Design a protein around this nucleic acid. Structure first.
Ligand SMILES: [Ca+2]
Ligand SMILES: [Ca+2]
Lengths: 153, 153
DNA sequence: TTGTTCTCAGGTACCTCAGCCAGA
DNA sequence: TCTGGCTGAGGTACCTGAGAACAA
């Protein structure tokens, strides 16, 4: 497990709290046991003009990708393991997104069991609802309620 | 002069590089000796729902004010002295806005003499152009050329 | 079936200026 | 004459979702 220095993590938390995003999503998918796929994402958005600053993040964190769309780029990290390691080290220094990070860490750790029973999956889905509630959510569609009404059949 | 905790400056530097703004402006002023007044401002913008976060800055930096402009609030610091003290301590940790901080610091230290010669004032005004060049400038009107055009007989 | 990569975009929440006015 | 406390806004640059496809 990669260990990050504290000066790196302090600055990064400030940058994440400002321009970053901690995202949990439930994605409709018929081929999945409970008809949905859980998706966790850490994101940093920045004008493509400064894509390099995001590229440095890849190098410095040791993983992730940079995507472009129009005039804006994103560093993204969604691989569960690395995500867990990074977030665990980052969360003590977060101020605006501390709870989201903690909610994500709790979803990750409970993932195995959530895959065994619908009630447990629905439960993890409510933690996802909470992340979205803390975020400035504006176009959310699939929620724990969606999942509940589908399993009720 | 207040000396700030280092953990705090690092976090803050990340937040400033994210949601903050280091700005220099030349304001046409009828009374001012050279027909213009210099304004240096440090801003942190955040949705009014998170005004408390800006309020804590007033407490932690020990100076400045918080204003409401719609659904959005801003922490603002523009008094020269306190601004100089704050920025000189922040600037080593800044990444995206280190240049602007340093140009502002240079302007501040040159303020006494810029009031003397008009060439010196136009000089300071070019350092203002550079801060604006480094920013995502979109609606800037008064520049050093503008001032140049005014100072004539 | 599952984890993940990659792209698009809705709706702001920022950013970075503009300018006034009272007191000093 | 100068400075600092106020306010309003143009034009994005973000945030936080959506969804398709591809391994494994
Ligand atoms: Ca922000
Ligand atoms: Ca930003």
């Amino acid at each position: 497990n990669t260990k990050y220095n504290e000066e790196f993590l302090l600055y990064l938390a400030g940058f994440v709290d400002s321009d970053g995003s901690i995202i949990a999503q439930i994605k409709p998918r018929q081929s999945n046991k409970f008809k949905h796929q859980l998706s966790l994402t850490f994101a940093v958005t920045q004008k493509t003009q400064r894509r390099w600053f995001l590229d440095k993040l890849v190098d410095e964190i040791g993983v992730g990708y940079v995507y472009d769309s129009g005039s804006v780029s994103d560093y993204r990290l969604s691989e569960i393991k690395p995500l867990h390691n990074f977030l665990t080290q980052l969360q003590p220094f977060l101020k605006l997104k501390q709870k989201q990070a903690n909610l994500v860490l709790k979803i990750i750790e409970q993932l195995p069991s959530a895959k065994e029973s619908p009630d447990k999956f629905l439960e993890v889905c409510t933690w996802v609802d909470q992340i979205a509630a803390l975020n400035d959510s504006k176009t959310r569609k699939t929620t724990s309620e969606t999942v509940r009404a589908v399993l009720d059949s």
